[PDB]
Amino acid sequence: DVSGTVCLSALPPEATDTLNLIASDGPFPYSQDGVVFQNRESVLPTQSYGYYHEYTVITPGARTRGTRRIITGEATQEDYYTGDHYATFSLIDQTC
Amino acid sequence: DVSGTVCLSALPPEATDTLNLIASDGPFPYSQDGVVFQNRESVLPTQSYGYYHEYTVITPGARTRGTRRIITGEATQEDYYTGDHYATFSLIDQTC
Numbered sequence: 001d002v003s004g005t006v007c008l009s010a011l012p013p014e015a016t017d018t019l020n021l022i023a024s025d026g027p028f029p030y031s032q033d034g035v036v037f038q039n040r041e042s043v044l045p046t047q048s049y050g051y052y053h054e055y056t057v058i059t060p061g062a063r064t065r066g067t068r069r070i071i072t073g074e075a076t077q078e079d080y081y082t083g084d085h086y087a088t089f090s091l092i093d094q095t096c
Numbered sequence: 097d098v099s100g101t102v103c104l105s106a107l108p109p110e111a112t113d114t115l116n117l118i119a120s121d122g123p124f125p126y127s128q129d130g131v132v133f134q135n136r137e138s139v140l141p142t143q144s145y146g147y148y149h150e151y152t153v154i155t156p157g158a159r160t161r162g163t164r165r166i167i168t169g170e171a172t173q174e175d176y177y178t179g180d181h182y183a184t185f186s187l188i189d190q191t192c
Binding site: 009014029058060061063 | 136137138142143
């Protein structure tokens, strides 16, 4: 289940950076940006393989790619945020 | 992010000195000159560890290394100036 909706203004600033890159189709910072997200634990609605893609939300100060990501679906504005390495997800509302 | 591009002629003259030292591979005035810049805060573009190196830009009259630095990237002509101790950066244009 999606844990609720979250305003874009409420997320770390880097979430806005990632969304802008998704909009332009990069170029992206990490080679893993844009890979298919398999939704193995069925946290997000069940879809055919390939429906979902994942992108890094940079965490300043981290030594790795970290745990923050944006998962996109095929619907318009269907963008989900996870700050906990896919445990929980929120749908992003870009109007607030 | 990078703030914009600045002509070398518009920076303190000590920046010109540091670039000249970088071109000749020293010798450098400070032992910290040439160490890897980790870009821990992700202000500059994400790159592999060792892509960036830091060099002192002398501040006239200072007893310490001060706050001015040039950060080199591995790409041709990729050099960044900071006058505020890595808070903000501008790309150096050596052609003007």
